[PDB]
Design a protein around this ligand. Structure first.
Ligand SMILES: CC(C)(C)c1ccc(C(=O)Nc2ccc(NC(=O)c3ccc4c(c3)OCCO4)cc2)cc1
Ligand SMILES: CC(C)(C)c1ccc(C(=O)Nc2ccc(NC(=O)c3ccc4c(c3)OCCO4)cc2)cc1
Ligand SMILES: CC(C)(C)c1ccc(C(=O)Nc2ccc(NC(=O)c3ccc4c(c3)OCCO4)cc2)cc1
Lengths: 442, 437, 437
């Protein structure tokens, strides 16, 4: 049954790979051009665009920039395709299945890339949220209705942001909560509360989300409750899925080598993506301004959903220093329409790493003794568990402040868990780091 | 007069030592065997048992390169007689009590008492309050000093329930004497509390005519309060008999020299003594060692950080401790049994306290531009700004886990006999972890 | 900015030159010139000269293997003269003030001042607020920067009480000039507060036309508040004159080279200078050393763990400190008096602050299953009309274990330009590392 999942993920990767190969054939891209991440992005965006039901209710066409190697120089062409031609090729590549999962996979890869490329300081202040809540904004770029995969991967902040957005619409325009489809806007609000509720790993945070969901007329008080909850999630962190989702060319490349993902199985959270990246070859266009090592770090972080991970941890796994966004001499992977193709060079993206680690959906949340009884006449504090003991007596906000105050930045999580060698396939022999400088953005 | 007490406890220790030597001679134990802590336990249990027609238990011998367990038997009368002879014809209640309290300290450090707590309607996380829960219900004044707030609540809950179920418990000639016992226990509990409010609530519970469900609820509330407004509980370093016996066999004169259960003396005695333990296949000797050390100093429910600092080695939580306890069961396999030196020494010593915590500087003014917290004494400063449960919740809510207690008090060097130069522990380079259980 | 270094340089030059001239006039040996007791006397002679029309004090001499304490006398005019010559005819008020602050720092580190505090209706536990309480009431701008909130409050209470006793203090032509003194002092206090609330309450006090018992109460409240919402108080490393004297004699050119009271300069100067001290028979030289070190760097009220870290040896509480103070009283026995080198060096340096403490990512979201702590910025996150009430609210909110000076580190003594901060890792649960109590 573990292997049933590996086979289905395997099948999904296969599909994306096949589709990528087919798209390279139709565009008559060389093997070199096919491994250009910029070309991967365009091909990806085209297929997603082709299925965007929302958007598609010519403008019956899709496209974007394709890049070509023309005597060792890079030339940008803008191409155009029929959404129904691309939808047709996608289904053929996926054996007639509609392969929603594969579409969602590529979405989640874009999201991870967005989370690693753009601080969302603008979006946060315009919502009345604190711009320092950016570690909470995983998946803030995904479409509002996404997979179950879409929801697993969204951050607590993303979910709060979406709920705030709705509450505000309702305050400005007092007809948002009404109409014939008022009942379905209401269920949408409750649905999002429950998603949020399910990310929280304490009774008190879960109870506060119940209060918010159950709110008759959601307004300014619920705004305030949600801001408080988002703040709390900076310390009592929510469970957020982390999925290593790679550009389509990498899967395409591997399928073209005769790699059989379905037979072999595949996991977004185990060794597989690390192994696949150890042996794949991806190029990127790169601006004269830009350090290739920095471009490389960007994609690496995106590939493993690591924007908001401790740079210490990221560095240790990677074997190269993973550097803060403020020290990073690169602007991001897509190339604008106004950029001059003539001074554009290209390098190999370093996407490998020293070790691997499993990806978690955990936030790090941890009878028995809850106080000390002093034995020795010695100057010190006398520890006790203030959240639990005082819990015996009136607000959710008070319980949560207590827990937040109880938590200490130096509390250790994931006790026993470690990184692994790329030769340690079955994750037998953890290597626990020792650490002495940790946030990507700030 | 300080030195009067030292002499008295010295005389008690002497007696235990002499008794132990005399038992080792009767059993023809080698010096190694005499320092086996399992042997010490049996000998201890025999003498206590003799004062509660035959008595005995497992004695362990090194025979043909192996540890052999034999089961020995003695007349209570013969053991009593040897005890009195060892103690110069005194009855030596105190010496009996001392061994009892050692057993208790060992029990407290070996076994969480989760079972007992839930069966009483008490929360299993109240185990820091359960010191001495294993002692017999009537023991010394020494007995009662050493018993925890939780132990005392548990005893009074047990008695309230007996009175509910059997409505003849509080009535008759029997009921005059059970009543005085209930009051006596309420006073003992009262005397351990260090706030007027907690004391008043114990007065209300005592003064209850017909103690039932309301008093039960008062007592659990009190116990819960004692997790923050902690009670006074005596801590006494009481060592296995073999250690005293060993010392006495060296010509140590406890009566002339004097002894203290709360100053340097047990730490000095442990620096230079040598105890062994049987040890099971899966067991780490350093972990067995930590167990006995904690027991010896009554430190089961102390902050592991404090215990580490004094000891000089990491004192690790019960859940991370590869050992199962010091007595060996009768169905255990003696063939797989090895033995090791218990490491019972320590880097420093500290005075043992009966206190449970709470001019002079009460704040720091930063001088240097350096990353750190800025201490101040929040209890004292905020103190500048009529139902008893409400008063107590107010105090609990005031308190903070990082409030400092025992201001000015610190550990000592083993060469600082007179307790001249306290050293305040810092826990900066130290790794976290406060609760043994 | 290099104009300031040059002017502080010029001031230091002057003190050094003056000290060298005074050592010549007294015919002091190299050794005697570097004796801190002789430095103190020469210092308080010059200060005294600018306060019969004689001045002087104890000068100590190494004569035939014995320390001889002789009393010298001088005309205030002669010493004023020498001072101005040394300072090229400037009247070097700043230099006089520098020495005053050194004596103040030495006072703060030697004496608790519990007497003065009760006699003003202040709490004797307010001693962390009493930096500079020994300075003259008017001492230049340097004087005022260095004075604590408590000192300021104490001086305003002194003035309120003069106004109560003499019910025409506030009144006439002399009542206009006492009024401006009061307002000046209120403004100095106001400027040290880093909250709107505290500042508004100082406005209320200043604007009182007839200050009495209500303003007293307001100022005690404010002093209590500064134990948690701390004032800005300058810290200035001011060394004994003999150190500067020594340095000038070595051909150090403080005016060309520049100098800072808050940067590396005083640490470098002390690292490589050599100061001696008389020491009584029951005194530990290491302890005397600590005292002088703390005074030099104005560290009396600093967290001992911070002082310990910078210094490289344990900086020990005042109660554990075997020394009685640097001056020697007239009835002390010179025959039993020995002398040692003060250990004034340190392992690192740290910038001195005038601060009191208190967008981007402020927390981590774990991506990999890997053992580690989970950083977040606790102070920032947790941070989320009657002035008294506003202040009590903020005092009650504050957490002693909040970190201040985030990112700020110590430096190597080679690191002039403060290039490479080394950030220590203190335990934030620790709120006990006070010099006094
Ligand atoms: C997240 C999904 C798509 C499954 C969803 C779930 C519920 C709803 C909904 O609109 N209404 C609703 C009403 C009550 C609840 N209650 C709980 O979800 C709930 C109540 C108690 C719980 C708990 C969940 O988690 C496990 C233990 O405790 C949930 C949803 C919408 C979407
Ligand atoms: C030590 C003094 C000088 C008081 C002394 C004691 C006993 C004797 C003596 O005549 N007999 C004697 C009998 C027994 C012992 N000791 C033990 O049999 C014995 C005593 C204590 C033991 C032990 C073995 O095992 C290890 C430590 O605990 C020692 C001497 C002579 C001097
Ligand atoms: C600590 C007391 C004095 C209570 C004590 C300790 C151990 C014993 C004991 O049974 N044996 C024992 C063995 C060695 C020693 N002590 C020393 O070897 C010793 C003790 C102190 C010393 C010293 C050596 O030299 C360095 C510092 O001063 C003391 C007792 C008896 C009494």
């Amino acid at each position: 049954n573990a292997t049933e999942i590996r086979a289905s993920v395997g099948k999904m990767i296969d599909g994306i790979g096949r589709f990528y190969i087919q798209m390279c054939t139709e565009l008559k891209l060389s093997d070199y051009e096919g491994r250009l991440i910029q070309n991967s992005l365009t091909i990806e965006r085209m297929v997603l665009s082709a299925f965007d039901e929302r958007r598609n209710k010519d403008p019956k066409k899709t496209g974007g920039p394709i890049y070509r190697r023309v005597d060792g120089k890079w030339r940008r062409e803008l191409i155009l395709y029929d959404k129904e031609e691309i939808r047709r090729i996608w289904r053929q590549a996926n054996n007639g299945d509609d392969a929603t999962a594969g579409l969602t996979h590529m979405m989640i890869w874009h999201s991870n890339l967005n989370d690693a490329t753009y601080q969302r300081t603008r979006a946060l202040v315009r919502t009345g949220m604190d711009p320092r809540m950016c570690s909470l904004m995983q998946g803030s770029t995904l479409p509002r209705r996404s997979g179950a995969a879409g929801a697993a991967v969204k951050g607590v902040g993303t979910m709060v942001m979406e709920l705030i957005r709705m509450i505000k619409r309702g305050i400005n325009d007092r007809n948002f909560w009404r109409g014939e489809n008022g009942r379905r806007t209401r269920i949408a609000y409750e649905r999002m509360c429950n998603i949020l509720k399910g990310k929280f790993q304490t009774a008190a945070q879960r109870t506060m989300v119940d209060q918010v969901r159950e709110s008759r007329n959601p307004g300014n008080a619920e705004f305030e409750d949600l801001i408080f909850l988002a703040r709390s999630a900076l310390i009592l962190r929510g469970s957020v899925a982390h999925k290593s989702c790679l550009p389509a060319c990498v899967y395409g490349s591997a399928v073209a080598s005769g790699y059989d993902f379905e037979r072999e199985g595949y996991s977004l959270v185990g060794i597989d993506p690390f192994r696949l990246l150890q042996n794949s070859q991806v190029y990127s266009l790169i601006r004269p301004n830009e350090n290739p090592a920095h471009k490389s770090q960007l994609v690496w972080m995106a590939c493993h959903s690591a924007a908001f991970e401790d740079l210490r941890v990221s560095s240790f796994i990677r074997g190269t220093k993973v550097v803060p966004r403020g020290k990073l001499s690169t602007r991001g992977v897509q190339i604008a329409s106004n950029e001059n193709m003539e001074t554009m060079e290209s390098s190999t993206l370093e996407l490998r790493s020293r070790y691997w680690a499993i990806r978690t959906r955990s936030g790090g949340n941890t009878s028995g003794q809850i106080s000390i009884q002093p034995t020795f006449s010695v100057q010190r504090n006398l520890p006790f568990d203030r959240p639990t003991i005082m819990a015996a007596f009136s607000d959710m906000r008070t319980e949560i402040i207590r827990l937040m105050e109880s938590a200490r930045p130096e509390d250790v999580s994931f006790q026993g868990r470690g990184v692994f060698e790329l030769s340690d396939e079955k994750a037998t022999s953890p290597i626990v780091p020792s650490f002495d400088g940790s946030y990507f953005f700030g």
